[PDB]
Design a protein around this ligand. Structure first.
Ligand code: AH1
Lengths: 99, 99
């Protein structure tokens, strides 16, 4: 798909067997989703941005399906305002920026 | 050009006669630059980030060249960790996400 940025680039993702709405975010190094439970061992992490830092739980080797393209990677879970797909998973689906 | 995401999508921008580095960020609705002096009057604006809200100053019709593309638009100045080019300017340079 070729996605215009007149609006926020929201897409559906399937994770944990759940369907969710997420933003394709090229400015984000990591993927961060709102509170949910994933199976596995997790590690605490602090991630910061505009507004300061938030504590998240880091889960590795998670499978996600973005618009139909499976991808595997680390996923951070915490009190984020919107589900964000960052560069660690966008590279796996082959997403590029073009102008 | 086509930009992949294995590295942060950093580009050089020219604003006020000077060169700065900035991040092409499809997750950011607006463009926010680190503290600097711009001409004119500014208006107040509050932006929600990952760690909360920050108050920034909004300047309108500012000329900024991004990778050789001249754009004119709204730029916010505030305590951001990095210069961020958001959708309001990414649309003026014809940027899309492709996968
Ligand atoms: O705070 C952020 N994050 C922080 C972050 C860091 C790592 C992983 C995920 C997120 C970066 C931006 O900041 C940084 C900080 C450090 C390094 C790189 C980018 C995203 O890239 C932006 O897209 C947007 C992401 O989060 C949100 C929150 C609410 C609604 C929509 C998006 N903003 C806020 C923002 C909003 C508007 C203009 C400018 C910046």
């Amino acid at each position: 798909p070729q996605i215009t940025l007149w609006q926020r680039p929201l897409v559906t993702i399937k994770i944990g067997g759940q369907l969710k709405e997420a933003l394709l975010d090229t400015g984000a190094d990591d993927t961060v989703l709102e509170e949910m439970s994933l199976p596995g061992r997790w590690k605490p992490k602090m991630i910061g941005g505009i507004g300061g830092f938030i504590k998240v739980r880091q889960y590795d080797q998670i499978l996600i399906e973005i618009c139909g393209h499976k991808a595997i990677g680390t996923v951070l879970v915490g009190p984020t305002p919107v589900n964000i797909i960052g560069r660690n998973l966008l590279t796996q689906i082959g997403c590029t920026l073009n102008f």
